[PDB]
Amino acid sequence: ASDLNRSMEQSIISGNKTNLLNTISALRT
Amino acid sequence: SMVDEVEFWLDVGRLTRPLLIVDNNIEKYNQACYKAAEARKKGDKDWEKHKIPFIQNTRFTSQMAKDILAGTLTLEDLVAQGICEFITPEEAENCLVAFSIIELRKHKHDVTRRFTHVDVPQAILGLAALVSPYANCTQPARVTYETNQGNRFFQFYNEMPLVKTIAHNYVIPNGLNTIVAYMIYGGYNQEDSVIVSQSFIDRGGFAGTFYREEKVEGANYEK
Amino acid sequence: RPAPSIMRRLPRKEGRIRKSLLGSQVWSISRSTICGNSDLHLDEVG
Amino acid sequence: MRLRYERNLNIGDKMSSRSGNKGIAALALPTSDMPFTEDGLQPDLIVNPHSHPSRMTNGQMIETTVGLANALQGVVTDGTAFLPINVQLLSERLAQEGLRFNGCQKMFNGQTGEYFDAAIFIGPTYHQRLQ
Amino acid sequence: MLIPVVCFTCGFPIGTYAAIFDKARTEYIKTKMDGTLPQNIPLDASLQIELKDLITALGIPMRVCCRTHLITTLDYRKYY
Amino acid sequence: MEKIFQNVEIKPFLIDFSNPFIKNAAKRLFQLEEQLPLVPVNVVMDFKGISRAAVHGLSRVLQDEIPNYMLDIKPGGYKIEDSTDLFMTEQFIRNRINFIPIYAKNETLVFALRSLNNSCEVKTIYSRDLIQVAGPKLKYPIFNPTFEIGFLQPGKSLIIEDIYIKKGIGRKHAAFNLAVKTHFSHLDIEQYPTDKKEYMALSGYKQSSMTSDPRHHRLGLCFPAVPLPHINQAVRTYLKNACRIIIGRIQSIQKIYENFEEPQPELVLFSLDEEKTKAIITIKDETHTIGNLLKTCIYEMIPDISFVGYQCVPHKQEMVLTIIHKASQEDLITLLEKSIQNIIQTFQILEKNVDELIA
Amino acid sequence: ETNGLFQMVATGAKGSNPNMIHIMAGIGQIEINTQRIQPQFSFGRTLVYYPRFALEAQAYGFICNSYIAGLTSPEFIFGEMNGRFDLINKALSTSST
Amino acid sequence: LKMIFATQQLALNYVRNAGFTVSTADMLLTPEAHQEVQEIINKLLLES
Amino acid sequence: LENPKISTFQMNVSACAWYNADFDGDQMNLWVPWSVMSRVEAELLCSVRNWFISTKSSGPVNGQVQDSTVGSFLLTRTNTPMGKNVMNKLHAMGLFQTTQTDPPCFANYSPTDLLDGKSVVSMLLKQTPINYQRAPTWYSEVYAP
Ligand SMILES: [Mg+2]
Ligand SMILES: [Zn+2]
């Protein structure tokens, strides 16, 4: 139910926050 | 070599990089050396003539570079042929790499320095590092040694740097070619300060829009 | 981790003693970036 | 709900060259108060020379020279790291284009109009604003 | 997004010619890069063609700032 | 007679249509086979027998501090609708419009911009799309029609209604800047050959600026847009205007002097008791032009002056001029009035020479 | 008389003689903890660019180039090691202090 | 402190007339000096 | 600072030595005392004039830094590339127009007279006499050969 999607979302929420060079470097980080 | 084990790895997470292969004629060199030794044994004294020079090179050519720049050739095509192969940190322990083609040419006829691969120097830097021009002429750590330790902006105007690097073939430049004067002008630019032109600011230089979203949503107006 | 206790308030850099008693948050205070000004005396601030 | 702020380059906004060199805008001057060369060229930015030694950023200087040459010629050249470089030949290229060997120029004080005794090093350098 | 209306440094109105320049340059580049023009053309090679005479013909004075901002400014139409 | 303004050279910047690429591009984009209505004009002028301070003051007055006109959007002029383009924000379009050079004599003109992209490709808004909606019909254009006002995505539109002429000085906003520096040299001072490596690190003049006192200068300024048929006239007006401006400012200071013995906030004069009188003059919204000019003329008038100086601190927005001299208050005031009259006469002679020469 | 960099270095305003010698006339041997570059890459190797048990000085952190001349890949790498060491030591010392 | 400020103003006002700058050519050795440096480096490598 | 566009805490560069600060994005806190007792104590006890001499080393924390040092060297330099390091009356006078002090007397100098930088420095120091003999950083045995 909501627990699955919400918990996976939260696992992504922890930090993991995203000019173009900076974004590409964050991806490559 | 310390222990006789041989390891094959095919798991995920292995960093890999393409490297040009270096071929040589060591087998022919050894055959010629043995023939020259036999000639010496015979006493004919032409053994010096039997020996042949050692040659180590790479199959990469200028035509291949032109094809790559024209889009005809790709890394997959090169790997399909014997020009280059992928190397990982594990296999890199068995590789002797010349840091540039200049080194390979310098030791072209040196049997003492048989190389296994050639590396393009720029491969030892990332995109962010490659953004800076003439990075090898600066010591980037000492630059930050003073600076070590310690909502979207859209900028209207951007320009390609007058001294462009490879990193700008893959990212959009953000900045301007500002006329910088290296001088003492009133002591207003001390301790890393910079004096700016008011007209440069007014004309839209480094001007943009900052966006903040109230998406989540005393005396106040309410009107 | 979320285990409230009376005696876990005191210890640590975030505890009562080191965060509330030694050091405090104060009103009537400003913070900003500093730049240079050659026309201000050594004992003046803009 | 979306809010937009018009953000010009304000005093106290960080500016950086490609080779580090983070800095803060400390003063803004009108066009009449900025220094100018005998050809009328004036700087968008004035940077203290005292940063270079400790920062050891010669790449900014080489970029300024190559940019002067390129702007006069009207091209954009490749300055990737580890490519062959000869600063003497870059200076000679500057000399050929009608400028001085060192790239310096005669400059005047905008406020008073008196020429500086020493030729000043002014040229195009790539700069960006940190967020 | 476009070539600035006036030069950022000195305020010379380069923009008056900007559009024309952006056209002429294109044609000029093609002519110098004679042969196939399939857009395979290396950008780092197209940037090596000297546009000094073209800009001089446009009437822009021989000023470092104006030439720099004219030849280096990015156009949003091409990228987007 | 005096001929402070000795020689003038006017040379407009024109388009060379002999270049095939430029000709083709102009004809295709704008059907333009002739010089644009407004062209920049490069004026090189020689001044003899005038202090460097006055020449540089005139130069910077022309660059800014001279009344000038720009195009601005009245509040609410930018109409936000359903089809308004997202990229062409009001800030961007306002910045683009503000810095369009104009040569307008009437301030009552009001223009409008109404563009729609009904096509399937990005369209480009040019200045020729600007249409006059108020004021007497223009017999001659006030701006060139080749500027790229912006671009619109397919199906979008841009509507700005109230575009009017605004007056101001350059130093307050760069959009009012008038002149562009192109040359400044002193013909009185000999110069080294700077190509040699033993002199490339020096300015090239044979005299240090700390001892040199030049009196023969060449100053070259570029005006961004003047009517092609009226170049000689337009330039003349500019120069004359500049002179008047300076005189006006100087005259203000003179008034402050003429009211001594009457409590004034600007003039503060006292006696140092060494038979030295000290006078301090504080003028708000004053620039280095007037301060340097006053200092130079006072110094010339009183070679044995105990001290004369001025400070225009950037963060104070005022000019403070200090004069200390071994004389009584009335004598010092008379000397200052004499110096001010001398500089005013110099600039009047400059205006007359401008009129004789450029005409 | 007319050298800005030298005048800044000599008058004590900024810089030092080693900085001038590194910018011009060569960086020289790189030393970490008063030691050359130790063979961390592999048994008897310092980097992938040099053979096992290399005898040349360049293989252990000797830079024959100057910053103006330009540094090759191994020289740049060794300089990077040294600079990162300086930064890490500074951080550790700050924390301990 | 007052004298520090006044001397700073004096120095800045002097530099206002006698400009100061750093150029790229300030870090450029002459060819003969370059050859001398190369000789020194070669001697060190010979000792090694 | 009454300019509405300025929003930074502006300080003299020579003051940075107190706080070990640079204008590379460093931030600072500032609070104005409002009570009478706190204002009196701030004015009488915590004024930066008290911190001029370091408590750690018993030495001067503050002095000329960067452009001030090189500018002093150039000013007191005996010889310039153009010749002798001299200035006319006008420029010598102009050197003193931003010092925020009482201007000295130049009534004894003709407009064509030449003044050395040592002379102007001598006037400024004669404002507060002191005796000092030593060698400068300019003179180094390393560069002497
Ligand atoms: Mg800092
Ligand atoms: Zn320009």
CSV table of N, CA, C and O in Angstrom, one decimal, chain D residues 31 39-44 67-68 70-78 97 99 123-124, chain E residues 8-11 44 47-53 55 62-65 67-69 71-72:
chain,number,residue,atom,x,y,z
D,31,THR,N,31.0,54.4,-15.6
D,31,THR,CA,31.9,54.3,-16.7
D,31,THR,C,32.9,55.4,-16.7
D,31,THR,O,34.1,55.2,-17.2
D,39,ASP,N,43.4,53.4,-26.2
D,39,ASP,CA,42.5,53.0,-27.3
D,39,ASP,C,41.0,53.0,-26.8
D,39,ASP,O,40.2,52.7,-27.6
D,40,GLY,N,40.8,53.4,-25.6
D,40,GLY,CA,39.4,53.5,-25.1
D,40,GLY,C,39.0,52.2,-24.4
D,40,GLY,O,37.9,52.3,-23.7
D,41,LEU,N,39.7,51.1,-24.5
D,41,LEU,CA,39.3,49.9,-23.8
D,41,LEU,C,39.3,50.1,-22.3
D,41,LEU,O,40.3,50.6,-21.8
D,42,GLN,N,38.3,49.7,-21.6
D,42,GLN,CA,38.2,49.8,-20.2
D,42,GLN,C,37.7,48.4,-19.6
D,42,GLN,O,37.1,47.6,-20.3
D,43,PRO,N,38.0,48.1,-18.4
D,43,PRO,CA,37.7,46.8,-17.8
D,43,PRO,C,36.4,46.7,-17.2
D,43,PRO,O,35.9,47.6,-16.5
D,44,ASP,N,35.7,45.5,-17.5
D,44,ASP,CA,34.5,45.2,-16.8
D,44,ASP,C,34.8,44.9,-15.3
D,44,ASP,O,34.1,45.2,-14.4
D,67,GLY,N,43.3,35.1,-25.1
D,67,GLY,CA,42.1,35.7,-25.4
D,67,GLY,C,42.2,37.1,-26.1
D,67,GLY,O,41.5,37.4,-27.0
D,68,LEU,N,43.2,37.8,-25.7
D,68,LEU,CA,43.6,39.1,-26.4
D,68,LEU,C,43.9,38.8,-27.8
D,68,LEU,O,43.3,39.4,-28.8
D,70,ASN,N,43.1,36.1,-29.6
D,70,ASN,CA,41.9,35.6,-30.3
D,70,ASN,C,40.9,36.7,-30.7
D,70,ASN,O,40.4,36.8,-31.8
D,71,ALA,N,40.6,37.6,-29.7
D,71,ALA,CA,39.7,38.7,-29.9
D,71,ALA,C,40.2,39.6,-31.0
D,71,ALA,O,39.4,40.0,-31.9
D,72,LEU,N,41.4,39.9,-31.1
D,72,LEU,CA,42.0,40.7,-32.2
D,72,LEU,C,41.8,40.0,-33.5
D,72,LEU,O,41.4,40.6,-34.5
D,73,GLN,N,42.1,38.7,-33.5
D,73,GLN,CA,42.0,37.9,-34.7
D,73,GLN,C,40.6,37.5,-35.1
D,73,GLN,O,40.2,37.5,-36.2
D,74,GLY,N,39.8,37.3,-34.0
D,74,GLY,CA,38.4,36.9,-34.3
D,74,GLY,C,38.1,35.4,-34.4
D,74,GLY,O,37.4,35.0,-35.2
D,75,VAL,N,38.8,34.7,-33.5
D,75,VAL,CA,38.7,33.2,-33.4
D,75,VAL,C,38.4,32.8,-32.0
D,75,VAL,O,38.5,33.6,-31.1
D,76,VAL,N,38.2,31.5,-31.8
D,76,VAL,CA,38.1,30.8,-30.5
D,76,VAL,C,39.0,29.6,-30.6
D,76,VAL,O,38.8,28.7,-31.4
D,77,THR,N,40.1,29.6,-29.7
D,77,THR,CA,41.1,28.5,-29.8
D,77,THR,C,40.9,27.5,-28.6
D,77,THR,O,40.1,27.7,-27.7
D,78,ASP,N,41.6,26.4,-28.7
D,78,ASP,CA,41.5,25.3,-27.8
D,78,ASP,C,42.6,25.5,-26.7
D,78,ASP,O,43.8,25.6,-27.0
D,97,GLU,N,50.1,40.8,-33.8
D,97,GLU,CA,48.8,41.4,-33.9
D,97,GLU,C,48.7,42.9,-33.7
D,97,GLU,O,47.6,43.5,-33.8
D,99,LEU,N,49.9,44.5,-30.8
D,99,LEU,CA,50.0,44.8,-29.4
D,99,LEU,C,51.4,44.6,-28.9
D,99,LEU,O,52.3,44.4,-29.7
D,123,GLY,N,42.9,42.4,-20.3
D,123,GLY,CA,42.5,41.5,-21.3
D,123,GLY,C,41.2,40.7,-21.0
D,123,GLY,O,40.7,40.7,-19.9
D,124,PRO,N,40.7,40.0,-22.0
D,124,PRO,CA,39.4,39.2,-21.8
D,124,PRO,C,39.6,37.9,-21.0
D,124,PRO,O,40.4,37.1,-21.5
E,8,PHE,N,28.8,45.0,-23.6
E,8,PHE,CA,28.7,45.0,-22.1
E,8,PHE,C,29.8,45.9,-21.5
E,8,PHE,O,29.5,46.5,-20.5
E,9,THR,N,31.0,46.0,-22.1
E,9,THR,CA,32.1,46.7,-21.6
E,9,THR,C,32.0,48.2,-21.8
E,9,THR,O,31.9,49.0,-20.9
E,10,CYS,N,31.9,48.6,-23.1
E,10,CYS,CA,32.0,50.0,-23.4
E,10,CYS,C,30.6,50.6,-23.8
E,10,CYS,O,30.5,51.8,-23.9
E,11,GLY,N,29.6,49.8,-24.1
E,11,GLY,CA,28.3,50.2,-24.5
E,11,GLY,C,28.2,50.5,-26.0
E,11,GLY,O,27.2,51.1,-26.3
E,44,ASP,N,35.1,22.9,-33.1
E,44,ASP,CA,36.4,23.4,-32.8
E,44,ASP,C,37.2,23.8,-34.1
E,44,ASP,O,38.2,24.5,-34.0
E,47,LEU,N,35.4,27.2,-35.5
E,47,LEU,CA,35.7,28.4,-34.8
E,47,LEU,C,37.1,28.9,-35.1
E,47,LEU,O,37.5,30.0,-34.6
E,48,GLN,N,37.9,28.2,-35.8
E,48,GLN,CA,39.3,28.6,-36.2
E,48,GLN,C,39.3,29.6,-37.4
E,48,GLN,O,40.4,30.2,-37.6
E,49,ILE,N,38.2,29.7,-38.1
E,49,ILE,CA,38.2,30.6,-39.2
E,49,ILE,C,38.1,32.1,-38.7
E,49,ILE,O,37.3,32.4,-37.8
E,50,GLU,N,39.0,32.9,-39.2
E,50,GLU,CA,39.1,34.3,-38.7
E,50,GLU,C,38.0,35.2,-39.3
E,50,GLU,O,37.8,35.2,-40.6
E,51,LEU,N,37.2,35.8,-38.5
E,51,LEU,CA,36.1,36.7,-38.9
E,51,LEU,C,36.5,38.2,-38.8
E,51,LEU,O,35.6,39.0,-38.8
E,52,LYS,N,37.8,38.5,-38.7
E,52,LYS,CA,38.2,39.9,-38.5
E,52,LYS,C,37.7,40.7,-39.6
E,52,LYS,O,37.2,41.8,-39.4
E,53,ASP,N,38.0,40.3,-40.9
E,53,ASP,CA,37.6,41.1,-42.0
E,53,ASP,C,36.1,41.3,-42.1
E,53,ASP,O,35.6,42.4,-42.5
E,55,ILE,N,33.9,41.4,-39.6
E,55,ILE,CA,33.4,42.4,-38.6
E,55,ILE,C,33.9,43.8,-39.0
E,55,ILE,O,33.1,44.7,-38.9
E,62,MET,N,37.7,48.4,-34.2
E,62,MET,CA,38.7,47.3,-33.7
E,62,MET,C,38.9,47.5,-32.2
E,62,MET,O,40.0,47.9,-31.8
E,63,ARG,N,37.9,47.0,-31.5
E,63,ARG,CA,38.0,47.0,-30.0
E,63,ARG,C,37.8,45.6,-29.5
E,63,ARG,O,37.0,44.8,-30.0
E,64,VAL,N,38.7,45.2,-28.5
E,64,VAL,CA,38.7,43.9,-28.0
E,64,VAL,C,37.3,43.5,-27.5
E,64,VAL,O,36.8,42.4,-27.7
E,65,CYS,N,36.7,44.4,-26.7
E,65,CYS,CA,35.5,44.0,-26.0
E,65,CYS,C,34.4,43.7,-27.0
E,65,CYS,O,33.6,42.8,-26.9
E,67,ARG,N,34.5,42.9,-30.3
E,67,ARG,CA,34.7,41.7,-31.1
E,67,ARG,C,34.5,40.5,-30.2
E,67,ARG,O,33.8,39.5,-30.6
E,68,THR,N,34.9,40.5,-28.9
E,68,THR,CA,34.8,39.4,-28.1
E,68,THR,C,33.3,39.1,-27.8
E,68,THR,O,32.8,37.9,-28.0
E,69,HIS,N,32.5,40.1,-27.5
E,69,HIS,CA,31.1,39.9,-27.2
E,69,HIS,C,30.3,39.6,-28.4
E,69,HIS,O,29.3,38.9,-28.3
E,71,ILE,N,31.5,37.8,-31.2
E,71,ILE,CA,31.8,36.5,-31.7
E,71,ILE,C,31.6,35.3,-30.6
E,71,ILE,O,31.5,34.2,-31.0
E,72,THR,N,31.5,35.7,-29.4
E,72,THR,CA,31.4,34.6,-28.3
E,72,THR,C,30.0,34.4,-27.8
E,72,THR,O,29.8,33.4,-27.1
